[PDB]
Symmetry: C4
């Protein structure tokens, strides 16, 4: 369970690094620094305005942004559900 | 578990085909090709702006669009829960 | 499991009747007939724009609308989760 | 299971008190009294417009508001899942 939380932190930090690099210049309010990026990716994980509010406006500049977000959603919104269920069984 | 993923892909591809045909001309930004349709239906599945952002604007042109989306939501937002639980059991 | 689905249909139909009566005149696009009401309450159940998009605009006319929606959400977004989990265990 | 519901009520009431104090003057429609605050925090819990609709506009005045909401979400959107699962087990 602890190793799952360690995996998620590593995946969340690396994805927030990638997004800062990728969309930081074009979308500075959402990904202009590591902080804004970790915040945005937590919101994207909770699925709040992920497509309409974030990903569709991004894809308008970077047409392949879905290659990042869709797997990011699928990975985190699974590992989070796995980590949370893990403590419930314990 | 693998058969569940195979079922979802088939259902997702066929639904994305149907939507492209149905709403592609009237709503081309959301369903104008298979790609835009698979993207939109993934978002509809995640329940993000499904009614306000997508389905209500669609229903304004096609009043019966709910016959497509509501069952699509009920089917996928169950099969996804079934597929994800399936791998979890494959550990215990 | 079947009795759970029968309970939800009864609760969903009665709540859609109540909403048509309560907010049908003031909010006719969302609750102007039984059909629009069953549609809106399915969306409210999925939690999509429930507060910002629906309930906050309603509460602006009917300040106690939260006495309807909040319990409706708590009841359905539990019974649905119970009904769906029921078949998974079977 | 009952102790879980008692824990959530205490956490929900104290969080609604904190928010009224913190953002009540700057954001009075959402946190201007305890009532508006308990309503907003129920919506924040359900994840409805939490960031775009509530937290991002708040952070524009209080840049650290995420220190309140993010843990609040993590705590409630876990304790609610724990409380709901608790009654389900009390049958099997
Ligand atoms: C799952 C792990 C989730 C971790 C989430 C951490 C989010 C951090 C958000 C954040 O810090 N910012 C987002 C901005 O949108 C930047 C500013 O809020 C911050 O820099 C200020 O506090 C001051 O330093 C400057 O005013
Ligand atoms: C559960 C399964 C989830 C499947 C998700 C698949 C999403 C595919 C989305 C997609 O391919 N596009 C979305 C468009 O909205 C179009 C892209 O091909 C885009 O790169 C185009 O713009 C190019 O022509 C280059 O400009
Ligand atoms: C780390 C989890 C998310 C990993 C996702 C990796 C996708 C790689 C994205 C990419 O290379 N381009 C997208 C350009 O937008 C180009
Ligand atoms: C899984 C899709 C399930 C689709 C169910 C049938 C849709 C029929 C198309 C229709 O009449 N509308 C527009
Ligand atoms: C969990 C159970 C969920 C059941 C959901 C059923 C929703 C039915 C929605 C509905 O029928 N309408 C919603 C309108 O917003 C009315 C119109 O769509 C309908 O009357 C048209 O099909 C034509 O008759 C007139 O053009
Ligand atoms: C998990 C626990 C969930 C608790 C949810 C409690 C919600 C309570 C919301 C509430 O009381 N109001 C929301 C306001 O946004 C104010 C009402 O008292 C309203 O009726 C007022 O307008 C009156 O003064 C009459 O006009
Ligand atoms: C059937 C499930 C939902 C049952 C909820 C019942 C609430 C009753 C609402 C009410 O009487 N007024 C709200 C006025 O807006 C007055
Ligand atoms: C459960 C709430 C958890 C709240 C955690 C502390 C919040 C401190 C208040 C703050 O600095 N911000 C604005
Ligand atoms: Br998903
Ligand atoms: Br559902
Ligand atoms: Br809830
Ligand atoms: Br979470």
């Amino acid at each position: 369970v602890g190793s799952v939380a360690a995996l998620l932190t590593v995946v969340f930090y690396i994805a927030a690094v990638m997004a800062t690099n990728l969309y930081g210049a074009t979308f500075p309010e959402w990904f202009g620094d590591l902080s804004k990026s970790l915040y945005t990716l937590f919101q994207v994980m909770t699925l709040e305005s992920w497509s309409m509010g974030i990903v569709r406006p991004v894809m308008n500049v970077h047409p392949n942004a879905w290659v990042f977000f869709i797997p990011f959603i699928m990975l985190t919104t699974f590992t989070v559900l796995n980590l949370f269920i893990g403590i419930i069984v314990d």
